[PDB]
Amino acid sequence: RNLLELCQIDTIMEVNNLTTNEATPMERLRIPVQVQTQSGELCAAFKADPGLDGPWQSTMVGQLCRYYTQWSGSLKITFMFTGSFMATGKMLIAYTPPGGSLPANRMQAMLGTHVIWDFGLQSSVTLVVPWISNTHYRSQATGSFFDYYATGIVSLWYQTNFVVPIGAPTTAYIVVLGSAQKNFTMRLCRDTSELTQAAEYQ
């Protein structure tokens, strides 16, 4: 019954809002990973807070976050490696703590809070994103004005690489899920930010 329960829900938020089509969320939703010899390339980045990126908002969590003016809670983002069994490769997923910028660097990114993904070692890896805040609660919609609002950024990078026997696809997808941790709360409900009625009825 509680909205929070909905927040937990597995349902998937797209890594970054990239709209090949408005109609299909899918295109953004899956993020390609491919064999690339270069070292520390940026897989993807999104503002961690669900509101900003949008795909989060599209997700249940994002939607709910829109509902409540303030949310506090650790958010969890799971990533699933859709590639083939034969494939292997290692990735880095980092939360850049507020006060930092997006690292734009493998080294810079790595230090923050990160996990190292090992493909074949683990098909899926779980990133975790802590609640770090000056203020006890944060506001939902982050305008230019409110720093206190701002959660931070998430970025994915290639730790090692992506590698596959030829006979196997060069390219693969990763799918992103996200949820809220057990302790996650919202406040200051507002009129439905999540959905605005196209028209009201008499």
């Binding site: 409540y68 003016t69 200051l188 507002r190």
Partner: peptide
């Protein structure tokens, strides 16, 4: 209204029929 909210735009404004 809480501060989060959009406010009514007009007398008739829809939100004014607001649940919260």
């Amino acid at each position: 209204a809480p501060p989060g909210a959009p406010l009514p735009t007009r007398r008739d404004s829809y939100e004014w029929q607001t649940s919260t």
